[PDB]
């Protein structure tokens, strides 16, 4: 298993108001330029949220949600500072509850 860090918000906020996939795209391009393995992803309606270890987060989460996920904690620290209205946390994967850290429930 590896540890995944996440910032979770509503689709309203992260897909429409502040389409964060814009910032992710420029980060992906810069990673490419530097020959760096991409270690961050946007996941819409993430399946990880149904894991028992994340019950507290699911209990507070928007009905229609989306996560920025990374194996680099630093990045998620900055995503939280950048967006602020996001829940944050971490999980280990793959596991029984989270067989695919990047899977969507849609």
Author numbering: 1 to 106
Original paper wording:
Mg-protoporphyrin IX monomethylester cyclase (MgPME–cyclase) catalyses the formation of the isocyclic E ring by cyclising the methyl propionate side-chain at C-13 to the C-15 bridge carbon between rings C and D, generating protochlorophyllide (Pchlide). Recently, the small monomeric protein Ycf54 was identified as a second candidate component of the MgPME–cyclase. The Ycf54 protein has been identified as a component of the MgPME–cyclase complex.
A fourth Ycf54 mutant in which residue A9 was substituted with a glycine reduced Ycf54 levels by ∼75% and CycI levels by ∼50%. The FLAG-A9G construct, which like the A9G point mutation was present at lower cellular levels, pulled down CycI in quantities similar to those observed in the FLAG-Ycf54 control pulldown. Therefore, it is reasonable to conclude that although only a small amount of A9G accumulates, there is more than enough Ycf54 protein available to interact with CycI, so allowing the MgPME–cyclase to proceed unhindered. To investigate the structural basis for these effects of the A9G and R82A mutations in Synechocystis, crystal structures solved by molecular replacement against the WT Synechocystis Ycf54 were obtained for these two proteins to resolutions of 1.5 Å and 2.2 Å, respectively. Superposition of the A9G and R82A models on WT Ycf54 resulted in respective RMSDs of 0.19 Å and 0.28 Å over all Cα atoms, showing that there are no significant structural alterations between the WT and mutant structures. Thus, the phenotypes observed in A9G and R82A are not a result of the mutant proteins adopting a different conformation or failing to fold. Further analysis of the local structure around the A9G mutation shows that there are no alterations in the immediate hydrogen bonding network or surface electrostatics, indicating that the phenotypic consequences of the A9G mutation do not result from alterations in the structure. Comparison of the WT and A9G structures found no structural reason for the low levels of A9G observed in vivo. As our pulldown experiments show A9G Ycf54 interacts with CycI at levels comparable to WT Ycf54, it is unlikely that the reduced level of A9G has a structural basis. One explanation for the lower level of A9G could be that the glycine codon inserted is rare in Synechocystis, resulting in lower levels of A9G Ycf54 translation.
